[PDB]
Write a protein that binds this ligand. Sequence first.
Ligand SMILES: *[C@@H]1O[C@H](CO)[C@@H](O)[C@H](O)[C@H]1NC(C)=O
Ligand SMILES: *[C@@H]1O[C@H](CO)[C@@H](O)[C@H](O)[C@H]1NC(C)=O
Ligand SMILES: *[C@@H]1O[C@H](CO)[C@@H](O)[C@H](O)[C@H]1NC(C)=O
Ligand SMILES: *[C@H]1O[C@H](CO)[C@@H](O)[C@H](O)[C@H]1NC(C)=O
Ligand code: NA
Lengths: 91, 91, 105, 105, 72, 75
Amino acid sequence: RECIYYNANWELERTNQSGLERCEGEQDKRLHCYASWRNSSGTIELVKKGCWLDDFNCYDRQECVATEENPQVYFCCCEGNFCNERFTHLP
Amino acid sequence: RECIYYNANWELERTNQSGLERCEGEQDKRLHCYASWRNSSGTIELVKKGCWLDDFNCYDRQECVATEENPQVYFCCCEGNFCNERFTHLP
Amino acid sequence: SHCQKTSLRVNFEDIGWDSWIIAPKEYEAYECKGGCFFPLADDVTPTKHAIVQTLVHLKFPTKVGKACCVPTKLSPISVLYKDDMGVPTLKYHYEGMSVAECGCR
Amino acid sequence: SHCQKTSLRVNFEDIGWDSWIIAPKEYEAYECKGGCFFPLADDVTPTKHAIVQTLVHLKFPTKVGKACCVPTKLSPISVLYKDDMGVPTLKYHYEGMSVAECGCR
Amino acid sequence: PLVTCTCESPHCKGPTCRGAWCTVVLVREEGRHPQEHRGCGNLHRELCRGRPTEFVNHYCCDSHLCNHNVSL
Amino acid sequence: PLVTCTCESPHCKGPTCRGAWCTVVLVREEGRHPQEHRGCGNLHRELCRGRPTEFVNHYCCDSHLCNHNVSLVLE
Ligand SMILES: *[C@@H]1O[C@H](CO)[C@@H](O)[C@H](O)[C@H]1NC(C)=O
Ligand SMILES: *[C@@H]1O[C@H](CO)[C@@H](O)[C@H](O)[C@H]1NC(C)=O
Ligand SMILES: *[C@@H]1O[C@H](CO)[C@@H](O)[C@H](O)[C@H]1NC(C)=O
Ligand SMILES: *[C@H]1O[C@H](CO)[C@@H](O)[C@H](O)[C@H]1NC(C)=O
Ligand code: NA
């Protein structure tokens, strides 16, 4: 089970910048992928992408989609290898 | 911290017969020695001697003495190296 | 009435953690609800002590209490939270926030 | 008072183990008595979960319960007992019969 | 070396179960009248040696289905 | 890198205590009026970030004796 890794703040946090991640996880628990980005009126700045743990909000959701109305940080999770490659918004 | 080891039933239980024992014990817990024997009207048959774990009945007791009135099996514990070499009875 | 794992949707806003947890907004921690009733089912992992206490309680139900139903194993969850300087960062293995297994102790 | 370790002299005769425990006749198991009251003292080893649950309970004291005070570490005791064929034999490390440390879970 | 026991109890996923040995246990809880469960057991053999008290009776055996025709 | 805090609470073995940081915490348990403890803390820094709710207020700081002249509210 794999996800898209990305971390804009990499230099600062001393981590890789972009790539992929194999998800370490509990025996009979589910695994997920996440993406999060900022949105300054249409201009999209990526913030982080990567693996995410058995959280029911992502349960059986094929595409990575954010649901919040108007957030500081947009967030979305999903289930299925590399499902976080592309992401979108719709409350 | 050491005790007198003895096990009449040794052959049967596949263990040494007589000797001594160094007491494996918890960091800040106390250690003790025990003895137990049968008493068929004055005739004393030994049954077991050895290490015994932090049990308050033995707390700060110099000699190995049994306290029960008239028991099937006489038992006694104590605190202090080889305190179970000799033992006695008095309810 | 028996001892088991229960749903507990904690909402971070409810406990005022919305201030620094960006996601999720709520998550499944579980609850350990129910009584430890004799005899103690194997799937409750009873400790020797739990057994003994339980017995003693059967004899002194006013002086000694039943064993308690508690989380015995704990899964972590993932959370995206604001840095000390307001940077979205991620604890992927945020330890001990959700109930894995329940039991009697 | 709060959440703490308490004396519990268990007498094997009382729970009918006098049938096979030759010694001791009674021993100190402890009890874990008391409430897990916010804020949770460090010496109670609160788990994350315990903290969360405690908070949620502060808001929903009727639907969600406090954390329980349970034994968190267990010492063994030594016992001299009758074989399956009535031979005095010894478990030196009889596990989990006495309370070592208490806590909130 | 498992065996099959009758299972009359709340924690019963069926009419019978498999385990290390079979149990019949009589209990007084809660002030209620005594109730009698029958089932499996693989954890604490010692309990069986328990001499019956005024509030509990643990009885065990290890032959097939050996806990049907039996009360206390 | 410990520090010294004022200690007004039940779990207090003295008038002051030492720890990683100092706390002032306000709690409103069902039925009872809110009570305000002051003390140490070394376990769960996160709690401090807690925005104050209708039933609790966690406040922390890390200068010497910094939790005397200081009280709190709810919502
Ligand atoms: C970045 O990723 C590579 C593998 O692609 C790995 O060797 C290295 O440990 C990573 N650097 C980190 C974790 O800082
Ligand atoms: C902001 O970003 C999203 C994509 O993440 C875009 O689809 C949306 O229309 C943008 N504008 C708004 C609603 O602020
Ligand atoms: C008997 O005692 C000796 C040391 O005194 C020890 O080396 C040996 O292992 C003991 N026997 C057994 C099998 O416990
Ligand atoms: C049996 O042996 C004990 C142990 O020395 C002795 O003190 C006691 O008097 C004897 N008991 C009787 C009365 O047979
Ligand atoms: Na013998």
